[PDB]
Amino acid sequence: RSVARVYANVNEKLGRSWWDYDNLVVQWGVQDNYEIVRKVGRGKYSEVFESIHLPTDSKCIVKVLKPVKKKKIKREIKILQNLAGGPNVVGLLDVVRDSQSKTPSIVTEYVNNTEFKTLYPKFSDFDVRYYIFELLKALDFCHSKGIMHRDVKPHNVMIDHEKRTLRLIDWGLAEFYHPGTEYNVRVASRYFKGPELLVDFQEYDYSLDMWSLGCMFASMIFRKEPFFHGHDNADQLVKIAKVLGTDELYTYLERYDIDLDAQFDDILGRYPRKPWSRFVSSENQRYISSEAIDFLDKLLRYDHQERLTAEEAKEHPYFEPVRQAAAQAS
Numbered sequence: 001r002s003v004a005r006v007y008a009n010v011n012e013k014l015g016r017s018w019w020d021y022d023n024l025v026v027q028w029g030v031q032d033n034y035e036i037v038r039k040v041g042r043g044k045y046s047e048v049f050e051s052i053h054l055p056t057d058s059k060c061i062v063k064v065l066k067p068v069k070k071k072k073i074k075r076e077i078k079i080l081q082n083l084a085g086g087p088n089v090v091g092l093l094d095v096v097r098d099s100q101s102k103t104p105s106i107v108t109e110y111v112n113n114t115e116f117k118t119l120y121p122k123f124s125d126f127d128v129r130y131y132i133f134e135l136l137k138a139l140d141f142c143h144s145k146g147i148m149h150r151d152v153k154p155h156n157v158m159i160d161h162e163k164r165t166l167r168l169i170d171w172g173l174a175e176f177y178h179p180g181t182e183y184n185v186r187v188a189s190r191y192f193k194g195p196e197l198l199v200d201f202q203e204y205d206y207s208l209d210m211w212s213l214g215c216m217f218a219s220m221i222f223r224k225e226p227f228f229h230g231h232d233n234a235d236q237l238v239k240i241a242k243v244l245g246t247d248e249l250y251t252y253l254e255r256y257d258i259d260l261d262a263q264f265d266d267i268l269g270r271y272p273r274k275p276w277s278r279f280v281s282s283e284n285q286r287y288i289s290s291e292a293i294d295f296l297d298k299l300l301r302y303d304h305q306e307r308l309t310a311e312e313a314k315e316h317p318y319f320e321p322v323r324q325a326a327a328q329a330s
């Protein structure tokens with residue numbers, strides 16, 4: 001019913017030793033070599049602390065996983081171990097657990113982040129091309145390793161603006177891509193869910209991350225957080241329908257033999273396609289260009305098979321200032 005456009009081969013050609021995370025045996029580190037300092041974050045199934053690796057006296061993050069659907073834990077570790085040394089991927093420092101409760105924590109590198117609602121409006125046009133390009137690099141890399149993040153959003157993109165460095169964090173929803181597998185559609189956060197998640201299409205792939213990327217980008221360049229602001233998962237598809245149009249939605253459903261649920265009968269009207277230019281304002285115009293609008297337009301497509309691959313999106317003209325800038329640095 002759907003195979004991915006790129007990278008479908010990858011987990012087949014890499015071994016079972018690459019994707020079979022149930023049979024991973026975790027060599028736990030020493031829990032007592034870490035000291036938790038201060039709370040820096042929380043989560044659905046987690047709490048995150050700034051911490052010190054005592055033997056080196058260094059800053060790090062400790063993320064205490066509170067589920068024990070225990071192979072979901074092995075999955076996140078296996079993906080972090082697999083993606084090691086990948087451009088712009090969080091560094092994995094250790095896995096430890098409490099000897100008595102066997103509650104596990106993941107220890108990652110600390111990144112001095114500015115929260116995006118503060119940080120994003122301080123970006124220049126070049127910043128945005130620059131930090132999206134660095135993020136594309138993380139996404140492309142893991143996609144080329146047969147992994148889907150499935151929770152791309154600002155909250156999982158730590159940015160040290162003074163160091164001009166980017167890390168993609170939170171691989172708790174990351175899963176391996178196997179052709180034809182019916183994955184869970186209850187992934188990602190509401191405002192970044194793809195149309196495929198919202199219409200219960202299960203045979204998705206790495207292109208889900210690109211729709212999410214486009215949601216991020218759209219809120220950066222139009223200065224509208226979140227760009228799609230549905231009150232629930234059904235209203236989420238209505239608020240996307242008001243932009244992209246109901247005509248191209250119906251062609252997409254027919255193209256994939258998706259039967260929209262009956263609840264949408266009363267809530268989904270006929271919507272014309274709103275051009276991207278109607279989101280241009282004076283306050284957000286600094287970010288606007290033809291290259292940008294064109295690039296957003298190839299991210300945010302009902303049909304996931306119409307979206308740019310991360311590799312393709314790096315090739316885009318929008319990013320040429322970033323490419324040539326790095327080339328002249330070299």
Ligand SMILES: Nc1ncnc2c1ncn2[C@@H]1O[C@H](COP(=O)(O)OP(=O)(O)NP(=O)(O)O)[C@@H](O)[C@H]1O
Binds near residue numbers: 111
């Ligand atoms: N390496 C890091 N450096 C700095 N802050 C971090 C780091 N990792 C996590 N954080 C902070 O901790 C928060 C939650 O981390 P996260 O890894 O997403 O846990 P989570 O429970 O899976 N959250 P979520 O699933 O998005 O609701 C982030 O939004 C950051 O503010």
Ligand SMILES: [Mg+2]
Binds near residue numbers: 171
């Ligand atoms: Mg998570």
